[PDB]
Coordinates of C-alpha atoms and ligand atoms in Angstrom, one line a residue:
Chain A
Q13 CA -154.5 -149.9 -240.9
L14 CA -154.8 -148.7 -244.5
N15 CA -157.5 -145.9 -243.8
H16 CA -155.4 -145.0 -240.7
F17 CA -152.4 -144.3 -242.9
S18 CA -154.5 -142.1 -245.2
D19 CA -156.1 -140.2 -242.3
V20 CA -152.7 -139.6 -240.7
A21 CA -151.1 -138.5 -244.0
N22 CA -153.9 -136.0 -244.4
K23 CA -153.4 -134.7 -240.8
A24 CA -149.7 -134.4 -241.5
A25 CA -150.3 -132.4 -244.7
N26 CA -152.8 -130.2 -242.9
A27 CA -150.2 -129.4 -240.2
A28 CA -147.5 -128.7 -242.8
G29 CA -149.9 -126.3 -244.7
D30 CA -150.8 -124.4 -241.5
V31 CA -147.1 -123.8 -241.0
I32 CA -146.3 -122.9 -244.6
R33 CA -149.1 -120.3 -244.9
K34 CA -147.4 -118.4 -242.0
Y35 CA -144.2 -117.9 -244.1
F36 CA -145.3 -117.7 -247.8
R37 CA -145.0 -114.2 -249.3
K38 CA -143.3 -112.7 -246.3
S50 CA -133.9 -118.2 -244.3
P51 CA -137.7 -117.9 -244.2
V52 CA -137.9 -120.8 -246.6
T53 CA -135.5 -122.7 -244.2
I54 CA -137.4 -121.9 -241.1
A55 CA -140.7 -122.7 -242.9
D56 CA -139.3 -126.1 -244.2
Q57 CA -137.9 -127.1 -240.8
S58 CA -141.1 -126.0 -238.8
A59 CA -143.4 -127.8 -241.3
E60 CA -141.3 -131.0 -241.2
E61 CA -141.4 -131.0 -237.4
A62 CA -145.2 -130.5 -237.5
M63 CA -145.6 -133.5 -239.9
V64 CA -143.2 -135.8 -237.9
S65 CA -145.1 -135.0 -234.6
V66 CA -148.4 -136.1 -236.2
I67 CA -146.9 -139.2 -237.8
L68 CA -145.1 -140.5 -234.7
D69 CA -147.9 -139.8 -232.3
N70 CA -150.0 -142.2 -234.4
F71 CA -147.3 -144.6 -235.6
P72 CA -144.4 -144.7 -233.0
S73 CA -143.1 -147.9 -234.8
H74 CA -142.5 -146.0 -238.0
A75 CA -139.4 -144.1 -239.2
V76 CA -139.1 -140.8 -240.9
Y77 CA -136.7 -139.5 -243.5
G78 CA -136.0 -136.0 -244.7
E79 CA -133.4 -133.8 -246.3
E80 CA -131.8 -132.1 -243.4
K81 CA -131.9 -134.7 -240.6
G82 CA -131.9 -138.0 -242.7
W83 CA -133.3 -141.2 -241.1
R84 CA -134.9 -140.9 -237.7
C85 CA -136.4 -143.8 -235.8
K86 CA -136.6 -144.6 -232.1
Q87 CA -136.0 -148.3 -232.9
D88 CA -133.2 -149.9 -234.9
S89 CA -135.4 -150.7 -237.9
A90 CA -138.9 -149.9 -239.3
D91 CA -141.1 -151.6 -241.9
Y92 CA -142.8 -148.3 -242.6
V93 CA -141.0 -145.1 -243.4
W94 CA -142.3 -141.6 -244.2
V95 CA -140.2 -139.7 -246.7
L96 CA -141.0 -136.0 -246.6
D97 CA -140.2 -132.8 -248.4
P98 CA -142.1 -129.9 -246.9
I99 CA -141.3 -127.5 -249.7
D100 CA -140.4 -129.0 -253.1
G101 CA -139.9 -126.0 -255.4
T102 CA -137.8 -123.7 -253.1
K103 CA -137.2 -121.2 -255.8
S104 CA -140.9 -120.8 -256.5
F105 CA -141.5 -120.5 -252.7
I106 CA -138.8 -117.8 -252.3
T107 CA -140.2 -115.8 -255.3
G108 CA -143.7 -116.0 -254.2
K109 CA -145.0 -118.4 -256.9
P110 CA -147.7 -120.7 -255.4
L111 CA -146.6 -123.9 -257.3
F112 CA -144.3 -125.4 -254.8
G113 CA -145.6 -128.5 -253.0
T114 CA -145.4 -130.5 -249.9
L115 CA -144.5 -134.2 -250.7
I116 CA -145.4 -137.0 -248.3
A117 CA -144.5 -140.7 -249.2
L118 CA -145.1 -143.7 -247.0
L119 CA -142.9 -146.7 -247.9
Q120 CA -143.6 -150.3 -246.8
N121 CA -140.5 -152.4 -247.1
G122 CA -139.1 -149.7 -249.4
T123 CA -142.2 -149.5 -251.7
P124 CA -144.4 -146.4 -251.8
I125 CA -147.9 -147.3 -250.8
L126 CA -149.2 -143.7 -250.4
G127 CA -148.1 -140.4 -251.8
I128 CA -149.4 -136.8 -251.4
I129 CA -148.7 -133.7 -253.5
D130 CA -150.1 -130.8 -251.5
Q131 CA -150.3 -127.1 -252.6
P132 CA -151.3 -125.4 -249.3
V133 CA -151.9 -121.9 -250.8
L134 CA -154.0 -123.1 -253.7
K135 CA -155.7 -125.7 -251.4
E136 CA -155.1 -128.6 -253.9
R137 CA -154.2 -132.1 -252.6
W138 CA -153.4 -135.1 -254.9
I139 CA -153.5 -138.4 -253.0
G140 CA -152.2 -141.7 -254.5
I141 CA -153.0 -144.9 -252.5
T142 CA -152.1 -148.3 -253.7
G143 CA -155.4 -150.1 -254.6
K144 CA -157.3 -146.8 -255.4
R145 CA -157.6 -144.3 -258.1
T146 CA -155.7 -141.1 -257.4
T147 CA -157.8 -138.1 -256.2
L148 CA -157.5 -134.3 -256.3
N149 CA -159.5 -132.8 -253.4
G150 CA -161.3 -136.0 -253.1
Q151 CA -162.4 -136.4 -256.7
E152 CA -160.9 -139.1 -258.9
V153 CA -158.5 -138.1 -261.6
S154 CA -157.0 -139.6 -264.7
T155 CA -154.2 -139.1 -267.1
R156 CA -155.0 -138.5 -270.8
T157 CA -154.0 -140.4 -273.9
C158 CA -151.6 -138.8 -276.4
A159 CA -151.3 -139.9 -280.0
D160 CA -147.5 -139.4 -280.5
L161 CA -144.5 -137.7 -278.9
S162 CA -144.9 -134.8 -281.5
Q163 CA -148.3 -134.0 -279.8
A164 CA -147.1 -134.1 -276.2
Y165 CA -146.9 -131.2 -273.8
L166 CA -143.7 -131.6 -271.8
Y167 CA -142.7 -129.9 -268.5
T168 CA -139.4 -129.7 -266.7
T169 CA -138.4 -127.4 -263.8
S170 CA -135.5 -125.6 -265.5
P171 CA -133.4 -125.9 -268.7
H172 CA -130.3 -125.4 -266.4
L173 CA -130.9 -128.6 -264.3
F174 CA -129.3 -130.9 -266.8
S175 CA -125.6 -131.3 -267.5
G176 CA -123.4 -133.4 -269.7
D177 CA -124.8 -136.6 -271.1
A178 CA -128.1 -135.9 -269.4
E179 CA -128.5 -132.6 -271.1
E180 CA -127.9 -134.2 -274.5
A181 CA -130.6 -136.8 -273.7
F182 CA -133.1 -134.2 -272.6
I183 CA -132.4 -132.2 -275.7
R184 CA -133.3 -135.3 -277.9
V185 CA -136.7 -135.6 -276.2
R186 CA -137.2 -131.8 -276.0
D187 CA -136.8 -131.3 -279.7
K188 CA -139.4 -134.0 -280.5
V189 CA -142.3 -132.9 -278.3
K190 CA -145.1 -130.4 -279.2
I191 CA -143.7 -127.8 -276.9
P192 CA -141.3 -127.8 -273.8
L193 CA -142.6 -125.8 -270.8
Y194 CA -140.9 -124.9 -267.6
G195 CA -141.2 -123.8 -264.0
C196 CA -143.2 -126.0 -261.6
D197 CA -141.4 -128.8 -259.8
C198 CA -143.8 -131.4 -258.4
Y199 CA -146.8 -129.4 -259.7
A200 CA -146.1 -130.5 -263.3
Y201 CA -146.5 -134.2 -262.2
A202 CA -149.8 -133.3 -260.5
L203 CA -151.0 -131.7 -263.7
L204 CA -149.9 -134.9 -265.6
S205 CA -151.9 -136.9 -263.1
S206 CA -155.0 -134.8 -263.8
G207 CA -154.6 -135.2 -267.5
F208 CA -153.4 -131.7 -268.6
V209 CA -149.7 -132.6 -269.2
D210 CA -148.3 -135.5 -271.2
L211 CA -144.6 -135.8 -270.2
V212 CA -142.3 -134.7 -267.4
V213 CA -138.5 -135.3 -267.8
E214 CA -136.1 -134.3 -265.0
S215 CA -132.6 -135.1 -264.0
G216 CA -131.0 -135.0 -260.5
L217 CA -134.0 -135.5 -258.2
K218 CA -133.4 -136.7 -254.7
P219 CA -135.8 -139.4 -253.3
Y220 CA -137.9 -137.0 -251.2
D221 CA -138.5 -135.1 -254.5
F222 CA -140.0 -138.1 -256.3
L223 CA -141.2 -141.0 -254.1
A224 CA -144.6 -139.3 -253.4
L225 CA -145.1 -138.9 -257.1
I226 CA -145.2 -142.6 -257.8
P227 CA -148.5 -143.7 -256.3
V228 CA -150.1 -140.4 -257.5
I229 CA -149.1 -140.9 -261.1
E230 CA -149.5 -144.7 -261.3
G231 CA -152.9 -144.4 -259.6
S232 CA -154.0 -141.9 -262.2
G233 CA -153.1 -144.3 -265.1
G234 CA -149.7 -142.9 -265.9
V235 CA -146.2 -144.3 -265.9
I236 CA -143.1 -143.1 -264.1
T237 CA -139.6 -144.7 -264.3
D238 CA -135.9 -143.9 -264.4
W239 CA -134.5 -143.0 -267.8
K240 CA -133.8 -146.6 -268.7
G241 CA -137.4 -147.5 -267.9
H242 CA -136.6 -149.3 -264.7
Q243 CA -138.5 -149.0 -261.5
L244 CA -137.7 -145.9 -259.5
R245 CA -136.9 -147.3 -256.1
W246 CA -135.1 -146.0 -253.1
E247 CA -135.3 -147.9 -249.9
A248 CA -135.1 -145.6 -247.0
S249 CA -133.1 -147.2 -244.1
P250 CA -130.6 -146.3 -241.4
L251 CA -127.8 -146.6 -244.0
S252 CA -129.4 -145.4 -247.2
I253 CA -127.7 -142.6 -249.1
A254 CA -129.9 -139.9 -250.7
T255 CA -128.5 -140.1 -254.2
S256 CA -129.8 -138.3 -257.4
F257 CA -132.1 -139.9 -259.9
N258 CA -133.4 -139.2 -263.4
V259 CA -137.1 -139.4 -263.9
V260 CA -139.5 -139.7 -266.8
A261 CA -143.2 -139.6 -266.3
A262 CA -146.0 -139.9 -268.9
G263 CA -149.7 -139.9 -269.1
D264 CA -149.7 -142.6 -271.8
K265 CA -147.5 -145.7 -271.9
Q266 CA -146.9 -145.3 -275.6
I267 CA -145.5 -141.8 -275.2
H268 CA -143.4 -143.0 -272.3
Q269 CA -141.7 -145.6 -274.5
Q270 CA -141.1 -143.0 -277.2
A271 CA -139.4 -140.8 -274.6
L272 CA -137.2 -143.7 -273.5
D273 CA -136.3 -144.4 -277.1
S274 CA -135.2 -140.7 -277.5
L275 CA -133.3 -140.5 -274.2
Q276 CA -131.2 -143.5 -275.3
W277 CA -130.0 -143.9 -271.7
Chain B
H12 CA -162.7 -88.1 -260.4
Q13 CA -162.9 -89.8 -263.8
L14 CA -160.0 -92.3 -263.1
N15 CA -162.2 -93.7 -260.2
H16 CA -165.0 -94.4 -262.7
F17 CA -162.5 -95.9 -265.2
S18 CA -161.2 -98.1 -262.3
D19 CA -164.7 -99.3 -261.4
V20 CA -165.5 -100.2 -265.0
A21 CA -162.1 -101.9 -265.5
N22 CA -162.9 -104.0 -262.4
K23 CA -166.3 -104.9 -263.8
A24 CA -164.6 -105.9 -267.1
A25 CA -162.1 -108.1 -265.2
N26 CA -164.9 -109.7 -263.3
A27 CA -166.8 -110.5 -266.6
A28 CA -163.6 -112.0 -268.1
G29 CA -163.0 -114.1 -265.0
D30 CA -166.5 -115.6 -265.0
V31 CA -166.0 -116.7 -268.6
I32 CA -162.5 -118.1 -268.1
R33 CA -163.5 -120.2 -265.0
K34 CA -166.0 -122.0 -267.3
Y35 CA -163.3 -123.2 -269.6
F36 CA -160.1 -123.7 -267.5
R37 CA -159.3 -127.3 -266.8
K38 CA -162.0 -128.6 -269.2
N39 CA -159.4 -130.4 -271.6
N40 CA -158.2 -133.6 -269.9
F41 CA -160.1 -135.9 -272.3
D42 CA -157.7 -136.2 -275.3
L49 CA -162.1 -124.5 -281.9
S50 CA -160.0 -125.2 -278.7
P51 CA -161.3 -124.3 -275.2
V52 CA -158.5 -121.7 -275.1
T53 CA -159.7 -119.9 -278.3
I54 CA -163.3 -120.1 -277.2
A55 CA -162.5 -118.7 -273.7
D56 CA -160.2 -116.0 -275.1
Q57 CA -162.8 -114.8 -277.6
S58 CA -165.7 -115.0 -275.2
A59 CA -163.8 -113.3 -272.4
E60 CA -162.8 -110.5 -274.7
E61 CA -166.4 -110.0 -275.8
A62 CA -167.5 -109.9 -272.1
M63 CA -165.0 -107.2 -271.3
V64 CA -165.8 -105.2 -274.5
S65 CA -169.5 -105.2 -273.7
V66 CA -168.8 -103.8 -270.2
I67 CA -166.4 -101.2 -271.4
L68 CA -168.6 -99.9 -274.3
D69 CA -171.8 -100.0 -272.2
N70 CA -170.1 -97.4 -270.0
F71 CA -168.0 -95.6 -272.5
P72 CA -169.4 -95.6 -276.0
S73 CA -166.9 -92.9 -277.0
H74 CA -164.0 -95.2 -276.2
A75 CA -162.2 -97.7 -278.5
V76 CA -161.1 -101.2 -277.8
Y77 CA -158.1 -103.1 -279.2
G78 CA -157.1 -106.8 -279.1
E79 CA -155.2 -109.4 -280.9
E80 CA -157.9 -110.9 -283.1
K81 CA -159.9 -107.9 -284.2
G82 CA -157.4 -105.0 -283.8
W83 CA -159.0 -101.6 -283.4
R84 CA -162.7 -101.3 -283.0
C85 CA -164.7 -98.1 -282.2
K86 CA -168.2 -96.8 -283.0
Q87 CA -166.4 -93.6 -284.2
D88 CA -163.4 -93.0 -286.4
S89 CA -161.1 -91.9 -283.6
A90 CA -161.0 -92.0 -279.8
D91 CA -159.0 -90.3 -276.9
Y92 CA -159.4 -93.4 -274.7
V93 CA -158.4 -96.9 -276.0
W94 CA -158.7 -100.2 -274.0
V95 CA -156.0 -102.7 -275.0
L96 CA -157.0 -106.2 -273.9
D97 CA -155.4 -109.7 -273.6
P98 CA -157.9 -112.1 -272.1
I99 CA -155.4 -114.9 -271.7
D100 CA -151.8 -113.9 -271.4
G101 CA -150.0 -117.3 -270.9
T102 CA -152.0 -119.5 -273.4
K103 CA -149.6 -122.5 -272.8
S104 CA -150.2 -122.3 -269.0
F105 CA -153.9 -122.1 -269.6
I106 CA -153.9 -125.2 -272.0
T107 CA -151.8 -127.2 -269.5
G108 CA -153.9 -126.3 -266.5
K109 CA -151.3 -124.1 -264.8
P110 CA -153.2 -121.3 -263.0
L111 CA -150.6 -118.5 -263.8
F112 CA -151.9 -117.1 -267.0
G113 CA -153.5 -113.7 -266.6
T114 CA -156.1 -111.3 -268.0
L115 CA -154.5 -108.0 -269.0
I116 CA -156.4 -104.7 -269.3
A117 CA -154.8 -101.4 -270.2
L118 CA -156.5 -98.1 -270.6
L119 CA -154.6 -95.6 -272.8
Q120 CA -155.3 -91.8 -272.9
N121 CA -153.8 -90.3 -276.0
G122 CA -151.6 -93.3 -276.3
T123 CA -150.3 -93.4 -272.7
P124 CA -151.4 -96.1 -270.2
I125 CA -153.3 -94.6 -267.3
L126 CA -154.6 -97.9 -265.8
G127 CA -153.5 -101.5 -265.9
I128 CA -154.9 -104.7 -264.5
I129 CA -153.2 -108.1 -264.1
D130 CA -156.0 -110.5 -263.1
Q131 CA -155.6 -114.2 -262.2
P132 CA -159.2 -115.3 -262.1
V133 CA -158.5 -118.8 -260.7
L134 CA -156.3 -117.6 -257.8
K135 CA -158.5 -114.6 -257.4
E136 CA -155.5 -112.1 -257.4
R137 CA -155.9 -108.7 -259.1
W138 CA -153.1 -106.2 -259.4
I139 CA -154.3 -102.7 -260.3
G140 CA -152.1 -99.8 -261.4
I141 CA -153.6 -96.4 -261.7
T142 CA -151.6 -93.2 -262.5
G143 CA -151.4 -91.2 -259.3
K144 CA -151.9 -94.1 -256.9
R145 CA -149.7 -96.8 -255.5
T146 CA -150.4 -100.2 -257.1
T147 CA -152.6 -102.6 -255.2
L148 CA -153.1 -106.4 -255.0
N149 CA -156.6 -107.2 -253.9
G150 CA -157.0 -103.7 -252.6
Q151 CA -153.8 -103.7 -250.5
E152 CA -150.8 -101.5 -251.5
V153 CA -147.7 -103.3 -252.8
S154 CA -144.1 -102.3 -253.4
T155 CA -141.1 -103.6 -255.3
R156 CA -138.0 -104.4 -253.2
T157 CA -134.4 -103.2 -253.3
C158 CA -131.7 -105.5 -254.6
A159 CA -128.0 -104.8 -253.9
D160 CA -126.5 -106.0 -257.3
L161 CA -127.4 -107.9 -260.4
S162 CA -125.5 -110.9 -258.9
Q163 CA -128.2 -111.0 -256.2
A164 CA -131.2 -110.7 -258.5
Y165 CA -133.9 -113.3 -259.1
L166 CA -134.8 -113.2 -262.8
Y167 CA -137.8 -114.5 -264.6
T168 CA -138.6 -115.0 -268.2
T169 CA -141.4 -117.1 -269.8
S170 CA -139.2 -119.5 -271.8
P171 CA -135.6 -120.0 -272.8
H172 CA -136.8 -120.6 -276.4
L173 CA -138.5 -117.2 -276.8
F174 CA -135.2 -115.5 -277.8
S175 CA -133.4 -115.7 -281.1
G176 CA -130.3 -114.3 -282.7
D177 CA -128.8 -111.1 -281.3
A178 CA -131.6 -111.0 -278.7
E179 CA -130.7 -114.4 -277.4
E180 CA -127.1 -113.4 -277.1
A181 CA -128.1 -110.3 -275.1
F182 CA -130.4 -112.3 -272.8
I183 CA -127.6 -114.8 -272.1
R184 CA -125.3 -111.9 -271.0
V185 CA -127.9 -110.9 -268.3
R186 CA -128.9 -114.4 -267.5
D187 CA -125.4 -115.5 -266.7
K188 CA -124.9 -112.5 -264.2
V189 CA -128.0 -112.9 -262.1
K190 CA -128.4 -115.0 -258.9
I191 CA -130.7 -117.4 -260.8
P192 CA -132.8 -117.4 -263.9
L193 CA -136.4 -118.9 -263.5
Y194 CA -139.0 -119.7 -266.0
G195 CA -142.6 -120.2 -266.9
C196 CA -145.3 -117.6 -266.1
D197 CA -145.8 -114.8 -268.5
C198 CA -147.5 -111.7 -266.9
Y199 CA -147.5 -113.3 -263.4
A200 CA -143.7 -112.8 -263.1
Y201 CA -144.3 -109.0 -263.5
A202 CA -147.0 -109.2 -260.9
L203 CA -144.6 -110.9 -258.5
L204 CA -141.9 -108.2 -259.3
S205 CA -144.6 -105.6 -258.4
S206 CA -145.2 -107.2 -255.1
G207 CA -141.5 -107.4 -254.3
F208 CA -140.7 -111.1 -254.7
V209 CA -138.8 -110.9 -258.0
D210 CA -136.1 -108.5 -259.1
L211 CA -135.9 -108.7 -262.8
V212 CA -138.0 -109.8 -265.8
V213 CA -136.4 -109.8 -269.3
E214 CA -138.4 -110.8 -272.4
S215 CA -138.2 -110.5 -276.2
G216 CA -141.0 -110.4 -278.7
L217 CA -143.9 -109.2 -276.7
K218 CA -146.9 -107.5 -278.5
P219 CA -148.5 -104.4 -277.0
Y220 CA -151.5 -106.2 -275.5
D221 CA -148.9 -108.4 -273.6
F222 CA -147.1 -105.4 -271.9
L223 CA -149.1 -102.2 -271.8
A224 CA -151.1 -103.2 -268.7
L225 CA -147.8 -104.0 -266.9
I226 CA -146.6 -100.4 -267.1
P227 CA -148.8 -98.7 -264.5
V228 CA -148.7 -101.8 -262.3
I229 CA -144.9 -101.9 -262.2
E230 CA -144.3 -98.1 -262.1
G231 CA -146.9 -97.6 -259.4
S232 CA -145.2 -100.2 -257.2
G233 CA -141.9 -98.4 -257.4
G234 CA -140.4 -100.3 -260.3
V235 CA -139.0 -99.5 -263.7
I236 CA -140.0 -101.0 -267.1
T237 CA -138.5 -100.0 -270.4
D238 CA -137.4 -101.4 -273.8
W239 CA -133.9 -102.9 -273.9
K240 CA -132.3 -99.5 -274.6
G241 CA -133.9 -98.0 -271.5
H242 CA -136.5 -96.0 -273.6
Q243 CA -140.1 -95.6 -272.7
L244 CA -142.3 -98.5 -274.0
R245 CA -144.8 -96.7 -276.0
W246 CA -147.3 -97.9 -278.5
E247 CA -150.2 -95.7 -279.6
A248 CA -153.3 -97.9 -280.4
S249 CA -155.1 -96.3 -283.4
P250 CA -157.0 -97.3 -286.5
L251 CA -153.7 -97.7 -288.4
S252 CA -151.4 -98.9 -285.7
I253 CA -149.5 -102.2 -286.3
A254 CA -149.0 -104.6 -283.3
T255 CA -145.3 -104.9 -283.6
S256 CA -143.0 -106.8 -281.3
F257 CA -141.0 -105.3 -278.3
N258 CA -138.3 -106.3 -276.0
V259 CA -139.0 -105.6 -272.3
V260 CA -136.9 -105.3 -269.2
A261 CA -138.5 -104.7 -265.8
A262 CA -136.8 -104.3 -262.5
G263 CA -137.9 -103.7 -258.9
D264 CA -134.8 -101.5 -258.4
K265 CA -133.5 -98.7 -260.7
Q266 CA -129.9 -99.7 -260.0
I267 CA -130.5 -103.3 -261.1
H268 CA -132.4 -102.0 -264.2
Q269 CA -129.4 -100.0 -265.3
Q270 CA -127.0 -103.0 -264.7
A271 CA -129.3 -105.1 -266.9
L272 CA -129.3 -102.5 -269.6
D273 CA -125.5 -102.4 -269.4
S274 CA -125.4 -106.2 -270.0
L275 CA -128.0 -106.3 -272.7
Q276 CA -125.7 -103.9 -274.7
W277 CA -128.7 -103.1 -277.0
Ligands
HSA301 N1 -138.3 -130.1 -257.6 C1 -136.8 -130.3 -257.7 C2 -136.1 -129.8 -256.5 O1 -136.3 -128.4 -256.3 P1 -135.9 -127.6 -254.9 O2 -134.7 -128.3 -254.4 O3 -135.7 -126.2 -255.3 O4 -137.0 -127.7 -254.1 C3 -136.4 -129.6 -259.1 C4 -135.3 -130.3 -259.8 C5 -135.4 -130.8 -261.1 N2 -134.2 -131.4 -261.3 C6 -133.4 -131.3 -260.3 N3 -134.1 -130.6 -259.3
HSA302 N1 -146.8 -113.7 -272.3 C1 -146.1 -113.7 -273.6 C2 -147.2 -114.2 -274.6 O1 -147.6 -115.5 -274.4 P1 -148.9 -116.2 -275.0 O2 -149.0 -115.7 -276.4 O3 -148.8 -117.7 -274.9 O4 -150.1 -115.9 -274.3 C3 -144.9 -114.6 -273.5 C4 -143.7 -114.2 -274.4 C5 -142.5 -113.9 -273.9 N2 -141.8 -113.6 -275.0 C6 -142.6 -113.7 -276.1 N3 -143.8 -114.1 -275.7
MG303 MG1 -138.5 -132.9 -252.9
MG304 MG1 -150.9 -110.4 -273.8

């Protein structure tokens, strides 16, 4: 079973990438997203008809009333990058067992870069093991977030507290920043308002690299995909180094 | 035609920079820097190519300023090996190598090279801009309200310039961030409508001018005047504000908002 999950997840990512390349740098984003999701679901359910799938547009789908295994997909995380021709969007694939991610992929189909997190294994990038880096203090950390405008109210005030303590705040890449953290080139990622399909795949990738990823109180990020689950918004903080993670939590004051 | 020889040599210079840069990119995941080494070495590689071919030309960069075997030169190569140092340091492959050739102070050739992604935009006076040898064009945009805007960082504005940037920012469809010269490359290929930045040095923008103009775009200072900087033995690398647009009409609306 466990190899079979990895093999099928790769086949699904391959199918999504084949689709996406037909649309990149030509509604195109919507057509690409829908076609890539269909391609992934076909692969998944051909192999695992007892599983369920979950995505943004169509929600939960399962040919049975329940499933132990659920695939949570986002064909194009980073829609604004995609629309503007910037090749740092990603396809996100998470497989959840009883609501817990056991596999996550971040795939960049243009750059041909694929991060794979699997419970039990070290994360890989194009098949080679990766690791997060240590970081001596928050003042030395390189921080990413997608946009300064994707924070409001109390969350913006919290972000600013962290932002003003790091070495430098950088912007613009969605899931790719978490990939770079997993590979040891970024120290901290702080975001507000992510939906489950935008973060679940990140969890095994980051943890399997040696990093930490939680909500802004430091609690486990969890969203159990089910027939009745509601795709609510989450705040996320990821770090390469546990000590920097705790400093970030202390600054967020959430 | 001498511009074809200049193009050939510029391409050899970009190839040499890229070979250096690929040796150093994503070497820093174990906690002088790789970025300084890479930058210096890449500049040296380009300079060697340029001056092997053109001993009567000058070169100009950030660290060393003006260099020439003679006291003056008609042709000056202005170089930035790594535009987007923070992207380079953090493993984000959207920095670029910038090469501009100036004849009597005016850019006649510009390259934006991404050596990891293997994407090279070339602007040559007289020709349409190319990306990996294929012609490119900017796109039309119906109104500032429909424009996709990029800038490197929200924090690279201060004072009156920040206030002017905010006026534009709040009028566009969406403001996006993070990628230095690469945003101007995307504008040249017709995927971005507007780029607005403050505080660029000449090695950060001269290469952009032939690229953007040769794709059908417009690039000026914030008053709508020509961006001009004559590289010379006594020139000072001062800071400039830049606005680039795919569409002339959007450019003017942006100038109207900047109120500079
Ligand atoms: N990656 C998050 C979704 O982007 P998209 O919907 O453009 O694909 C970006 C984000 C950060 N905070 C809130 N949303
Ligand atoms: N591309 C400009 C230079 O970046 P670098 O010095 O990190 O390479 C970014 C910039 C915008 N406004 C001011 N500077
Ligand atoms: Mg997503
Ligand atoms: Mg520069």
